[PDB]
Amino acid sequence: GARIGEMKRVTKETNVSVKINLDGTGVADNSSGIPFLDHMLDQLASHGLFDVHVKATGDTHIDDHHTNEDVALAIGTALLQALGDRKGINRFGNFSAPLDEALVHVSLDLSGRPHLGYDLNIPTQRVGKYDTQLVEHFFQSLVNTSGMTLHIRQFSGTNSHHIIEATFKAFARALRQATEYDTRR
Amino acid sequence: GARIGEMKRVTKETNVSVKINLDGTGVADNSSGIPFLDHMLDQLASHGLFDVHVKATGDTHIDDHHTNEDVALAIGTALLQALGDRKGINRFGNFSAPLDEALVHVSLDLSGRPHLGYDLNIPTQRVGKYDTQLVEHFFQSLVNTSGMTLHIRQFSGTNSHHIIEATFKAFARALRQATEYDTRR
Amino acid sequence: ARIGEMKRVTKETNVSVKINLDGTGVADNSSGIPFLDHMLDQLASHGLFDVHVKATGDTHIDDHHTNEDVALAIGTALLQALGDRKGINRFGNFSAPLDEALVHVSLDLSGRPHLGYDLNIPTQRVGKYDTQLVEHFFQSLVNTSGMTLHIRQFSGTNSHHIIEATFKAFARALRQATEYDTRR
Amino acid sequence: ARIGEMKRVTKETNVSVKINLDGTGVADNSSGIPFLDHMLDQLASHGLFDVHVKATGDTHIDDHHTNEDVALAIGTALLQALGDRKGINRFGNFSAPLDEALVHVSLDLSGRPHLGYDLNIPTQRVGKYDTQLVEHFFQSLVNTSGMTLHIRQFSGTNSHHIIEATFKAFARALRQATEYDTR
Amino acid sequence: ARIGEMKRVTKETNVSVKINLDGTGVADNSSGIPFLDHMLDQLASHGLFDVHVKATGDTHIDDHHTNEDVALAIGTALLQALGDRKGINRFGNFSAPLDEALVHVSLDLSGRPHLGYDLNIPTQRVGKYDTQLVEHFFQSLVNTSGMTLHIRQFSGTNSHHIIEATFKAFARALRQATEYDTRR
Amino acid sequence: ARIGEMKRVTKETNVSVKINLDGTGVADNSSGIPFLDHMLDQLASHGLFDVHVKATGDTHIDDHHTNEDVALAIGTALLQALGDRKGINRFGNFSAPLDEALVHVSLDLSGRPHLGYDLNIPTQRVGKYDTQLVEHFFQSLVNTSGMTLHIRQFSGTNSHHIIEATFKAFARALRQATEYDTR
Ligand SMILES: [Mn+2]
Ligand SMILES: [Mn+2]
Ligand SMILES: [Mn+2]
Ligand SMILES: [Mn+2]
Ligand SMILES: [Mn+2]
Ligand SMILES: [Mn+2]
Ligand SMILES: [Mn+2]
Ligand SMILES: [Mn+2]
Ligand SMILES: [Mn+2]
Ligand SMILES: [Mn+2]
Ligand SMILES: [Mn+2]
Ligand SMILES: [Mn+2]
């Protein structure tokens, strides 16, 4: 069957609905209220071959922080639900993704023990309207609810959009590897 | 009885109305024209158990500075009015508040002598649309009209929203302690 | 009374934990690691928790797996005992001196795990206990309890004093956080 | 009420101290050192102790011997008042601002004496009071009371403010440590 | 089979290239530069490409023009063989050891040319081959293939080892990128 | 199945090793060194090798000779199992995290021995296991297997985590290198 996780999370700050298919075809259906995060979630779908559905409304008139955090939390929980007992999967994923001058390596373990090692050097404070501090917070929150070990390391890069997008491409392809089944097991 | 302070302050730049209940239940009713400041004033209510009512219109088309300053000034005066003779209260308040990776300590004395010692290190210039320089100015203006001694010290923190929100949480809980009655007196 | 229980059996360890947040300081700790037992006793005596920990494990390899699985189980029991966390102080703060050592702990039963760890332990072993396991104990406890936890050493030169002051401060900060806020 | 009393007569000093741990803030301090009297008053006012200190001594030499013997007697009086120390909070913590100064005090009525002292007092005299005597006051008090005491300055430029904030923080930390743990 | 061919004749050089992306490792390289031939052989043996390169040029001046025009022609042949690039892995990564040398290559058949080049080659000549030509080879190949290419040396002291490890890693990363993604 | 077996008896040690390159993760490790047994188990679990190690030795001196002779025998057993090394991937690469630790392993079953070792293990003992023996284990394994082996730590503060991540990465890199290149 297909491993699908779903989470609806409604707080005073945000209203979030997430659906992810680990065995998808790359369907991207993201409307988080944060356009740049939508663009990154689209890359998660296209490069991981996940089906990624995210719909959120939130207090973005304050800033994007609460929406960003609650979407990441919901995605992490949906990933955890889809993974189930995690029997027979590769479990580990590794990928170095270039995007022009940027190069970011991601290494991860669907271990059940949350840890984020974050070593990006994003040189500007905003990409579009998106606060670049929210990139670290997105992956921290996703790690916290999914229970994964996640290491993100920038080897090259000067354009903030390129650095962040390379991160999502590498994360997407590393996560695809980790979630795929180990045929020898 | 309940200690309630009220101040309406109308200038060429701003029109401000403030009502604070030191003996409240955490009612938050904040519409300052500055959404991030509203969010921080909500935390003042929820974490201090103050009832906090703030309504302001102002020249936010110039920037948020005048509104931020006049709201803080009015709040400080309302706090001073609510405190009265300050007989029998704890007078001093201390609290260290974490918010994820951030940790901010606040120490204060309802002394009648204004002083702000401000030692935050906010790494970005805007949270949402809110100019992070306005955090220091908010507490300076509040100190000036309330007459309190206020020390704010950041021990940890990398996310600007977390640092500022931890500051308001610690301030709220320190102020609650300082305003509560000393039963032994 | 808010009581949490967790029994966790792996190929490496067999762990049973019961904690009473509204206890009287009953300490009943046999983790297989004597120094950790001594620290868990302080949790009970200084936090006024009832703490029951029983574990066997592959300590012939090292104390790592037992230390980790005990901490994981305690965090889950703490989360279970806390329930909806309604009406509690939620935050706790305490600076504990122990002779020349002074350690501050600040914590929030927020549901969001984070460990900020700033101890400077000068030796590698207290008794047989590997001092690297102190950080791993609190990291694992944070991961299953959902706590925000900051530990900062302001003074200290004896490793036993530094670690014990940490547990005393943690115990008293956790007691404060779990107690009820009368106004709420 | 938990009252401690100590009369200490040396060739240098004649000191009488009485402290009520369960007092109301009664301050009656005449040590022969006016600034120390002001500080002991803050101990009563902010700790809600009743503090009676009367001393004569060889202040024509300097204030050192009087300062030392007063602190020794206070520490003994405090220990006597504490008794078996059963049921008390035992630990005390407080950060006290005084304008630009901010001093944290953490203590444990442990029975094991230790002073950790980290003030940065920028002048040598407040009035006629030698600022070296602040450290010696707390060291001697720790020696006879047997308490663990940590004093840390986080802010401060005025010597009077720094020292007064220290006594305010010490008084409130000591009040917390001597009070009963209701649970 | 995806086969690319390019014949490029200038006043300086006469170059003919044919590459089979779905080959068996057939190596047929006579560029006029023996060390480059040795490197192009590794492209075939380690990438399982069929690589045919024949060039004559003004090597009596130096190897520069031949090196550049060979690399330009290979990049064009690679682009021609790739076609619409539909359904392929697109990205390739490989770290190749060669004794003490270790070189990582990461590439994307993105269509956007970029060379990130971080080798530290300690000598100026391997045989008769000027080691400045290594960077120019990959820069020229990137320019005509439309590839994003990052080359990073993690270890290495022998220039022949460093350069050969680079071509082995490039060959295996390129093989991965050109192979088909079964799920797509 | 590709099985290698080596029995090595010195005046210091008596070692028997059997490895199945095409195994299912069967772990049967009794080297006399409990932490090394734990690491060899990870080799089986994460590499899907069948790993049988039985050794007795002069561990009353220290673990060095046992550690060394076990690694030598494993390297020989691996080489014997590889045979002509025809049709295999030959190269292996893997980055393995373990909580805060992250270790990359790159190797080539080249026949030319080399160890490039860049770990930063912050303590001298994990349990009773001397952490100097990690480098010596891989150096000896390289010497008898003839492999090119590069080990690089990118992150890590806990010695147990760093060493375990190294074995996980080595096991998965070795699995990749021994598997058949289908094309
Ligand atoms: Mn947040
Ligand atoms: Mn883009
Ligand atoms: Mn202004
Ligand atoms: Mn917020
Ligand atoms: Mn561990
Ligand atoms: Mn002890
Ligand atoms: Mn003296
Ligand atoms: Mn004064
Ligand atoms: Mn040129
Ligand atoms: Mn060669
Ligand atoms: Mn040796
Ligand atoms: Mn282990």
Numbering used by the authors:
A (entry chain A), B (entry chain A): 77 to 261
C (entry chain D), E (entry chain D): 78 to 261
D (entry chain C), F (entry chain C): 78 to 260
Text of the article:
Plant HISN5 catalyzes the sixth step of the HBP, in which imidazole-glycerol phosphate (IGP) is dehydrated to form imidazole-acetol phosphate (IAP). The MtHISN5 subunit contains a four α-helix bundle sandwiched between two β-sheets whose four strands are almost perpendicular to each other. In solution, MtHISN5 forms a homo 24-mer with octahedral (432) symmetry of approx. 110 Å diameter and a total mass of 540 kDa. The dimensions of the MtHISN5 oligomer did not change significantly after the binding of IG2, indicating a lack of major conformational rearrangements. The active site of MtHISN5 (see below) contains two Mn2+ cations (Mn1 and Mn2) bound by residues belonging to different subunits.
We also obtained the structure in space group I4 at 1.69 Å resolution with six chains in the ASU. The crystal structures cover the MtHISN5 sequence starting from Gly77 or Ala78 through Arg260/261 (chain and structure-dependent). The structure at 1.69 contains FMT, GOL, and TRS. The crystal structures were obtained in the presence of formate (FMT) between Mn1 and Mn2, which completes their coordination spheres. FMTs primary location was in the active sites, between Mn1 and Mn2. Consistently, we identified TRS (121 Da) and CIT (192 Da) in the 3- and 4-fold tunnels, respectively.
